[PDB]
């Protein structure tokens, strides 16, 4: 929603086949651009035919990636001061290609599924809130925390109705080494602020559930970020999460992702 | 009389090459690429007067022109070795040496400040001009606001809030004392519009009991720091402000920050961000 | 019959082109390095291939070899640009700029490869091949020690012990369950030696009356999660490991460490650093 | 102490002269390798005085800085191949090169003045350990952290003797913004493991204290860390810092460094 271009950092995000594209485009504009400054002065490109603007981009292009034939030469003080423009440039094009580039690979994405659901139903004898996530890659996330956090509608004594963000006691919130699947859970105890709380009041106080997730990621050295919003909707009252965790035809342990999001709920006549 | 600045930073004064390090990383873009291109120039030039001082080291070159061999130099450097221009002494052939280590010494420094610049974006946070005290949850509540001014999140936002004021010691001494203020809420998972953050004054409260009198004889100022993860780079930004005393409007509450245009829909109108209701008297 | 290997990987099964990325980050600079010759000249031989299509657009060059158009790539691609050969056709022209933006992107690669090694040095921290139980301070203590295997010291240093053993909840559903252990002591502020990591087995424990026995019935692991910033590369490092029931010397203690040298010196014995003393038993 | 060489980075903590002074020669002695090479082959470089070292030289830096003006030329199919390899090296030597100044420019300092000695002296009533710290730039770092670690010889039920880490209480120990000067504390209340000490006895103990420091420099846009240790010698029992904030002529508020190891100090007949 509003509020009261050069700066469009697109570059960071598209991808890649997009990135080289734009990179690649901006590469033939600006030599379009300096073949035509040649131009304007004549003919200062020793052995190019006149006028051309082929030989003139060529020439461009030898310069800027300092190629230098040297067939094609500058001749004015003119052609000279422009190759002396057109050879900061590449330099400087190059160093913020570099930069675009190495940006780009620590960016990375935190490879993390999250169950498109959530459940509610008994652990060690509470009614407890639970959805799980999974490490979708080999490497290994250390120090991963999560939160798990309500936001819902309230009212304070002055009569001003304000979303209030609580964020949920996890039986474990910090796993110091994260690799397969984690399912991270909120006792639905006194002290949780959705005690007594149904479905039918949860979808009254416009009640959602975020999920946020960081680690240091393996894979790359360098933290990451996921994180999931569940409404009311998404909610499973009374399933419990299919077991992910399995025994092979040898005995090997196996983990299998199919089930990851897989509820069992009891059905009656 | 301001200790802290509203920027946050420090007002008192200080007693007690590489200036130009911090200052390409700090400077706008314009002026970053005007010095890296004069630093090129110069560079340059200064080659070109090391291939005259050798006399006519350059062969195809005009005698004693430094128009020649500063394109000879600018050659050199780039590395575009035409070959029309080339060198002839040991001499000229050593500077050669010499100048291809700079450029690819000047390249890979060029390449570093800017990927450095590329990675120090600005937190693009509002501070509300001014805090307000009034009731919340039937508690008087310190105040202040927060908005984010790009469409990108920051995720995992903090705040801190602290006091600044002198204190005297049960031993007589004067001394400037930070309190960190227990917020209602110093956290943030998604910040994407707007933050009221509160600090309850209750029995707890440095600011228990104290008033606008007292405050200011304490010389008391506020200081807010923030941090986050800014999605729209993807790395850590973080902000700050500071208050005097005459920055709390005691009474006041902040304004409803949203807006209706014409066909209906919602916008943020930063524009009201600072202002502040207040209840006057007959 | 293990879930965790020693070096802190699962052991699990896992069912459910970006692949050579996290491997010429992974690999040894050896191979690295003939990765990277090895895409540097194909890269080139397709090239010199495509001029091949085009006939004889390389002048100066012996027509139909492959040798001559591939040296023309390389110069190129390089652009080292001598100028016996040099492109004819509009055809040859178009390939040698093609081919200069892919040098320039093979640099910048290159380069972010090579920084991202250096990047991310190894923690070079031992761990003991065995816990053991024994007393500290009158209890019952599970300890397991580190060493630092260079010279520089790591501060700001952490360590983590966690158990996983399986659990049956009042649902009667089996499932694995961390448990951290409170150490006697968590954190070294200069670890540059050795250190042994101590978890005292008081009422609070999840290993309180445990034995050998249960633990092996409940599957027992201990998982160590160390963390500290690394002077030698000025960043941070991490490092883990794991021990299965097997792996405690109930009763062993570690020995000390140290030795001495003919002048008289001492010198850390990393020989004995897994080394545990037992009572044996008439 | 012993333990029981290429890996010799003393590449990124060297001074900037001593850097480029082995830049310069790894640079050099490179170009002296491939002009022995080329020499080796004979006269494989096109416009060479045969057999010479100096214009083999020149050549090699032509074709490693990649200059490559085209009077010297290569023509055996050694000479290309060795032209081949070196173009690779001064790729891969360009690629390290700016690898490590990148690096150098990111593991910068504290920047951070540690008193050369502790007190200890009554703060609001209770006998306090003490000592400051100042930030030597004008940038702030944000999120600064001070620990204050006593480490001393103790004697365990078993009869062990060995280092024991106290993490001493601290008034105040994280600052959120640090620019200035910051008196760092430790209360020696009922709680304190120094509670009842005294000189002799920190001496007996072979008592030490550590303070750690991290925060991140606004400088940098990194965190730095400095630390520093302090023997029983350098507490001075009974001493109270000197201001160091004082008041201008104009009435300027003013820090002022030069006061900063100073030390007020009792003295009786
Ligand atoms: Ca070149
Ligand atoms: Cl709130
Ligand atoms: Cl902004
Ligand atoms: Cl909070
Ligand atoms: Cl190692
Ligand atoms: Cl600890
Ligand atoms: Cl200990
Ligand atoms: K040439
Ligand atoms: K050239």
Known sequence: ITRLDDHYHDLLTVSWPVFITLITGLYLVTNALFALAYLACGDVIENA???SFTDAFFFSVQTMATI????????????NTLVT??????????????SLIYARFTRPTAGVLFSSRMVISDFEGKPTLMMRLANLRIEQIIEADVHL?????EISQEGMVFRRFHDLTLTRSRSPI??????????????????????????????????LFTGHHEAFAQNVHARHAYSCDEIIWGGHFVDVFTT??????????????????????
């Not at 956090?149 to 509608?153: Q, T, Y």
């Open 248 to 269: 092979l035809p040898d005995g090997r342990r196996a983990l299998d992702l199919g089930k990851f999001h897989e509820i069992a709920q009891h059905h009656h006549h």
């Open 68 to 79: 230098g034939y040297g067939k094609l030469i500058p001749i004015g003080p003119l052609a």
């Open 85 to 98: 423009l057109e050879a900061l440039c590449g330099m400087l094009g190059l160093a913020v290609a570099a």
């Open 149 to 153: 956090v309500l936001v819902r509608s």
């Open 49 to 51: 035919r006149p006028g």
């Open 178 to 211: 994260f690799s397969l699947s984690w399912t991270v859970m909120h006792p639905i105890d006194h002290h949780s602020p959705i005690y007594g709380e149904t479905d039918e009041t949860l979808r009254n106080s416009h009640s959602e559930f975020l999920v």
